[PDB]
Amino acid sequence: LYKHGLALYRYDSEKQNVIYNIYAKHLSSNQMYTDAAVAYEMLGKLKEAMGAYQSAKRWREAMSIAVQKFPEEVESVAEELISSLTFEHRYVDAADIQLEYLDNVKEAVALYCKAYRYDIASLVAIKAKKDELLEEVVDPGLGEGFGIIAELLADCKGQINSQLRREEYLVQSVGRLIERLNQTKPDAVRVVEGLCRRNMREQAHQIQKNFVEVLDLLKANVKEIEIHDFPKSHIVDF
Amino acid sequence: EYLDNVKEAVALYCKAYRYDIASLVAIKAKKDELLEEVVDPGLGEGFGIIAELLADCKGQINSQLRRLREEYLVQSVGRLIERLNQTKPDAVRVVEGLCRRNMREQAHQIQKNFVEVLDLLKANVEIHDFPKSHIVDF
């Protein structure tokens, strides 16, 4: 009955203060740390909110407090934020921490090289005047993400060609891939263009010759058993 | 990044709904007078546009409920479904953002009315529920 207690004190803000402490304490234990952290701000408990943002991927809202009031833990807290975002594949915000707040320019590029924003990564190293990373990390990450796509192009190639020959689980497998395709569809766009920027004419043509034939193979079967057609690039299509 | 001009950037974030970023950059800039000068006028301008839009389309449902009681009117159904989910990520950042600057009355005003609008579409002859903050829910 925390909800009933402060509704009595909607206009009376002095009596209302302490109920925010004990109900957010109740939600400090039940894993909804945003309700914990935001209600701690309404009483001046900015240290107690900091770990709750760090408990709940709110890295800006923690370091907004931590640089303002706790200059001693600025370096330690942001490194632990990476370890959260390392496992859960948010490499972009992990690089956003790594660029400005821990000054590792090299490793922040490799997170863009993981998360297919090669356009951002090439901007950073030239702005920092560190142009060797274009040869060092950009080119392998383009080569790494090349094989990640082209293998998975063959995965949907071989599995459908095996499962057109063949009940209830089989129909689910048809719709399971096509969501993963349109998830991966814009990820392949940023790899074709970058390899064209790095003079990989065959490998960029290798992807688009493979990817179109998969969707050409896919268009027959769902009529038998929502398709977004792939936007071509007019340079490397021939 | 380039022009060494912070207030021009932060006032864009006041329009860009990224008050979670606009707090962080001015704190990193060590220029926290803009939280009063720039951020707080960005909050009410976000509040003014949204709380207009909450009550603007509210009566236009009732004017479409009562006039329909004729083929052009079908598109007015999904047109409000369109912008409702468009504005929903902008809606949450203003609710917490006024709670971050302890504007408890105006924050729940949008928050209660957004539930009031989203439940008004129950007799819907697709939708997405609002993640409701348990802090000012009373």
mmCIF file of N, CA, C and O in Angstrom, chain B residues 9-53:
data_model
loop_
_atom_site.group_PDB
_atom_site.id
_atom_site.type_symbol
_atom_site.label_atom_id
_atom_site.label_comp_id
_atom_site.label_asym_id
_atom_site.label_seq_id
_atom_site.Cartn_x
_atom_site.Cartn_y
_atom_site.Cartn_z
ATOM 1 N N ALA B 9 24.439 23.001 -29.821
ATOM 2 C CA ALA B 9 24.228 21.557 -29.809
ATOM 3 C C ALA B 9 23.147 21.157 -28.811
ATOM 4 O O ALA B 9 22.283 20.329 -29.124
ATOM 5 N N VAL B 10 23.173 21.737 -27.609
ATOM 6 C CA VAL B 10 22.264 21.305 -26.551
ATOM 7 C C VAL B 10 20.830 21.706 -26.879
ATOM 8 O O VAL B 10 19.883 20.960 -26.599
ATOM 9 N N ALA B 11 20.645 22.879 -27.489
ATOM 10 C CA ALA B 11 19.306 23.309 -27.873
ATOM 11 C C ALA B 11 18.735 22.450 -28.996
ATOM 12 O O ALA B 11 17.511 22.334 -29.122
ATOM 13 N N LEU B 12 19.597 21.846 -29.814
ATOM 14 C CA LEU B 12 19.133 20.823 -30.747
ATOM 15 C C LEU B 12 18.667 19.572 -30.012
ATOM 16 O O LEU B 12 17.654 18.969 -30.388
ATOM 17 N N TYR B 13 19.388 19.163 -28.964
ATOM 18 C CA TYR B 13 18.950 18.014 -28.174
ATOM 19 C C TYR B 13 17.646 18.303 -27.439
ATOM 20 O O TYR B 13 16.888 17.374 -27.138
ATOM 21 N N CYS B 14 17.371 19.574 -27.139
ATOM 22 C CA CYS B 14 16.065 19.944 -26.603
ATOM 23 C C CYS B 14 14.960 19.647 -27.608
ATOM 24 O O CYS B 14 13.848 19.264 -27.226
ATOM 25 N N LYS B 15 15.248 19.817 -28.898
ATOM 26 C CA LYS B 15 14.324 19.393 -29.942
ATOM 27 C C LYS B 15 14.467 17.911 -30.260
ATOM 28 O O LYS B 15 13.479 17.263 -30.623
ATOM 29 N N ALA B 16 15.674 17.361 -30.130
ATOM 30 C CA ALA B 16 15.941 15.973 -30.488
ATOM 31 C C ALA B 16 15.515 14.987 -29.410
ATOM 32 O O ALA B 16 15.788 13.789 -29.551
ATOM 33 N N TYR B 17 14.872 15.458 -28.341
ATOM 34 C CA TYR B 17 14.327 14.634 -27.263
ATOM 35 C C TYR B 17 15.394 13.874 -26.486
ATOM 36 O O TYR B 17 15.056 13.032 -25.646
ATOM 37 N N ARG B 18 16.672 14.145 -26.731
ATOM 38 C CA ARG B 18 17.756 13.438 -26.049
ATOM 39 C C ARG B 18 18.250 14.254 -24.855
ATOM 40 O O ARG B 18 19.411 14.651 -24.756
ATOM 41 N N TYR B 19 17.313 14.497 -23.934
ATOM 42 C CA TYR B 19 17.640 15.143 -22.666
ATOM 43 C C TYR B 19 18.563 14.278 -21.817
ATOM 44 O O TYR B 19 19.337 14.804 -21.011
ATOM 45 N N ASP B 20 18.491 12.955 -21.980
ATOM 46 C CA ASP B 20 19.468 12.074 -21.348
ATOM 47 C C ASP B 20 20.874 12.313 -21.882
ATOM 48 O O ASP B 20 21.854 12.132 -21.151
ATOM 49 N N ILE B 21 20.997 12.718 -23.146
ATOM 50 C CA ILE B 21 22.301 13.121 -23.663
ATOM 51 C C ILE B 21 22.591 14.573 -23.313
ATOM 52 O O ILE B 21 23.723 14.923 -22.958
ATOM 53 N N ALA B 22 21.579 15.441 -23.398
ATOM 54 C CA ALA B 22 21.807 16.869 -23.194
ATOM 55 C C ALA B 22 22.199 17.175 -21.754
ATOM 56 O O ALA B 22 22.870 18.183 -21.497
ATOM 57 N N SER B 23 21.792 16.328 -20.809
ATOM 58 C CA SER B 23 22.345 16.401 -19.460
ATOM 59 C C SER B 23 23.821 16.026 -19.445
ATOM 60 O O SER B 23 24.624 16.671 -18.764
ATOM 61 N N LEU B 24 24.197 14.985 -20.193
ATOM 62 C CA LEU B 24 25.537 14.422 -20.058
ATOM 63 C C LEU B 24 26.591 15.340 -20.668
ATOM 64 O O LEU B 24 27.689 15.481 -20.120
ATOM 65 N N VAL B 25 26.277 15.970 -21.802
ATOM 66 C CA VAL B 25 27.292 16.719 -22.536
ATOM 67 C C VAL B 25 27.611 18.025 -21.821
ATOM 68 O O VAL B 25 28.775 18.440 -21.749
ATOM 69 N N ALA B 26 26.592 18.690 -21.272
ATOM 70 C CA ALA B 26 26.832 19.922 -20.531
ATOM 71 C C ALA B 26 27.533 19.652 -19.205
ATOM 72 O O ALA B 26 28.291 20.500 -18.722
ATOM 73 N N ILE B 27 27.296 18.483 -18.608
ATOM 74 C CA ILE B 27 28.067 18.076 -17.436
ATOM 75 C C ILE B 27 29.510 17.776 -17.824
ATOM 76 O O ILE B 27 30.450 18.134 -17.102
ATOM 77 N N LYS B 28 29.712 17.132 -18.976
ATOM 78 C CA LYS B 28 31.069 16.909 -19.468
ATOM 79 C C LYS B 28 31.738 18.219 -19.864
ATOM 80 O O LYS B 28 32.954 18.368 -19.708
ATOM 81 N N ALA B 29 30.958 19.179 -20.365
ATOM 82 C CA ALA B 29 31.471 20.498 -20.708
ATOM 83 C C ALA B 29 31.755 21.353 -19.479
ATOM 84 O O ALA B 29 32.401 22.399 -19.614
ATOM 85 N N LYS B 30 31.291 20.932 -18.300
ATOM 86 C CA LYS B 30 31.433 21.700 -17.061
ATOM 87 C C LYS B 30 30.844 23.100 -17.213
ATOM 88 O O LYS B 30 31.438 24.104 -16.811
ATOM 89 N N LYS B 31 29.651 23.157 -17.804
ATOM 90 C CA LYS B 31 28.934 24.395 -18.086
ATOM 91 C C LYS B 31 27.478 24.256 -17.661
ATOM 92 O O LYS B 31 26.547 24.504 -18.431
ATOM 93 N N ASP B 32 27.270 23.855 -16.409
ATOM 94 C CA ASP B 32 25.971 23.401 -15.913
ATOM 95 C C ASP B 32 24.974 24.531 -15.717
ATOM 96 O O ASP B 32 23.880 24.262 -15.201
ATOM 97 N N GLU B 33 25.284 25.772 -16.095
ATOM 98 C CA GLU B 33 24.271 26.819 -16.114
ATOM 99 C C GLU B 33 23.271 26.650 -17.248
ATOM 100 O O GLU B 33 22.220 27.299 -17.224
ATOM 101 N N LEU B 34 23.565 25.801 -18.236
ATOM 102 C CA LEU B 34 22.645 25.598 -19.347
ATOM 103 C C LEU B 34 21.492 24.672 -18.984
ATOM 104 O O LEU B 34 20.479 24.659 -19.693
ATOM 105 N N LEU B 35 21.627 23.896 -17.906
ATOM 106 C CA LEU B 35 20.502 23.120 -17.398
ATOM 107 C C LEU B 35 19.339 24.024 -17.011
ATOM 108 O O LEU B 35 18.170 23.673 -17.211
ATOM 109 N N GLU B 36 19.643 25.198 -16.455
ATOM 110 C CA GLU B 36 18.632 26.227 -16.234
ATOM 111 C C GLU B 36 18.287 26.975 -17.516
ATOM 112 O O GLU B 36 17.107 27.194 -17.812
ATOM 113 N N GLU B 37 19.295 27.378 -18.293
ATOM 114 C CA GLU B 37 19.033 28.275 -19.413
ATOM 115 C C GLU B 37 18.417 27.546 -20.601
ATOM 116 O O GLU B 37 17.546 28.099 -21.280
ATOM 117 N N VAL B 38 18.856 26.324 -20.884
ATOM 118 C CA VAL B 38 18.553 25.650 -22.143
ATOM 119 C C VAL B 38 17.655 24.438 -21.916
ATOM 120 O O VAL B 38 16.677 24.233 -22.636
ATOM 121 N N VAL B 39 17.981 23.621 -20.912
ATOM 122 C CA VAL B 39 17.284 22.353 -20.709
ATOM 123 C C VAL B 39 15.858 22.596 -20.230
ATOM 124 O O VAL B 39 14.895 22.059 -20.791
ATOM 125 N N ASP B 40 15.705 23.399 -19.177
ATOM 126 C CA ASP B 40 14.379 23.671 -18.628
ATOM 127 C C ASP B 40 13.425 24.359 -19.599
ATOM 128 O O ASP B 40 12.221 24.046 -19.553
ATOM 129 N N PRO B 41 13.851 25.272 -20.481
ATOM 130 C CA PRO B 41 12.939 25.700 -21.553
ATOM 131 C C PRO B 41 12.717 24.640 -22.615
ATOM 132 O O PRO B 41 11.727 24.729 -23.353
ATOM 133 N N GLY B 42 13.600 23.643 -22.722
ATOM 134 C CA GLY B 42 13.333 22.522 -23.604
ATOM 135 C C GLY B 42 12.308 21.553 -23.060
ATOM 136 O O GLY B 42 11.670 20.837 -23.836
ATOM 137 N N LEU B 43 12.142 21.522 -21.736
ATOM 138 C CA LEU B 43 11.201 20.599 -21.109
ATOM 139 C C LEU B 43 9.761 21.027 -21.360
ATOM 140 O O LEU B 43 8.928 20.222 -21.791
ATOM 141 N N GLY B 44 9.448 22.297 -21.089
ATOM 142 C CA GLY B 44 8.100 22.782 -21.323
ATOM 143 C C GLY B 44 7.734 22.855 -22.789
ATOM 144 O O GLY B 44 6.564 22.680 -23.147
ATOM 145 N N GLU B 45 8.713 23.112 -23.660
ATOM 146 C CA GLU B 45 8.425 23.092 -25.090
ATOM 147 C C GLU B 45 8.156 21.672 -25.571
ATOM 148 O O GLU B 45 7.333 21.466 -26.470
ATOM 149 N N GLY B 46 8.835 20.686 -24.981
ATOM 150 C CA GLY B 46 8.431 19.305 -25.169
ATOM 151 C C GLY B 46 7.082 19.012 -24.541
ATOM 152 O O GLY B 46 6.251 18.312 -25.123
ATOM 153 N N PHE B 47 6.847 19.547 -23.340
ATOM 154 C CA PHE B 47 5.557 19.373 -22.679
ATOM 155 C C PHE B 47 4.445 20.088 -23.435
ATOM 156 O O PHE B 47 3.318 19.588 -23.508
ATOM 157 N N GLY B 48 4.741 21.258 -24.005
ATOM 158 C CA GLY B 48 3.706 22.015 -24.689
ATOM 159 C C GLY B 48 3.251 21.348 -25.972
ATOM 160 O O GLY B 48 2.057 21.322 -26.280
ATOM 161 N N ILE B 49 4.195 20.801 -26.739
ATOM 162 C CA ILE B 49 3.854 20.168 -28.010
ATOM 163 C C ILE B 49 3.105 18.862 -27.769
ATOM 164 O O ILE B 49 2.087 18.582 -28.413
ATOM 165 N N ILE B 50 3.597 18.044 -26.836
ATOM 166 C CA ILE B 50 3.018 16.721 -26.619
ATOM 167 C C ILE B 50 1.643 16.836 -25.972
ATOM 168 O O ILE B 50 0.683 16.186 -26.404
ATOM 169 N N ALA B 51 1.519 17.666 -24.933
ATOM 170 C CA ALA B 51 0.249 17.759 -24.224
ATOM 171 C C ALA B 51 -0.812 18.481 -25.044
ATOM 172 O O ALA B 51 -2.006 18.282 -24.801
ATOM 173 N N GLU B 52 -0.402 19.311 -26.003
ATOM 174 C CA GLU B 52 -1.312 19.709 -27.071
ATOM 175 C C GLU B 52 -1.759 18.492 -27.869
ATOM 176 O O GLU B 52 -2.959 18.274 -28.080
ATOM 177 N N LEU B 53 -0.797 17.680 -28.315
ATOM 178 C CA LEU B 53 -1.097 16.566 -29.209
ATOM 179 C C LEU B 53 -1.921 15.496 -28.503
ATOM 180 O O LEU B 53 -2.719 14.804 -29.147
#
